[PDB]
Amino acid sequence: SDPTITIKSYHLWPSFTDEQWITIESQMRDLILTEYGRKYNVNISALTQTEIKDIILGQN
């Protein structure tokens, strides 16, 4: 999403900083939980972090 953040020849993922990683992981959480909320018909804004952890890892 930002070509100023290159992928090194010997790496697989772009060269984010820690702050950029926090931003990226938050956006990824929003994406996954948006699809989950549509599929299962649940209010994402009410979920606990432990429920979110189970959803991310794919428990059951």
Partner 1 sequence: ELSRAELEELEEFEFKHGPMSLINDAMVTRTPVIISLRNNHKIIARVKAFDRHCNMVLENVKELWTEKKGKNVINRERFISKLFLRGDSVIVVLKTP
Cα–Cα dist 7/59, whole Å: 32
The CB-of-55 to partner 1 minimum distance in angstroms stands at: 26
Summarize as ranges the residues that interact with partner 1 (CB under 8 A). 1-4, 6-7
- 14 with 7: CB under 8 angstroms? yes
CB closer to partner 1 out of 27 and 54: 27
Beta-strand runs (E) in the chain: none
The CB-of-21 to partner 1 minimum distance in angstroms stands at: 18
The CB-of-29 to partner 1 minimum distance in angstroms stands at: 20
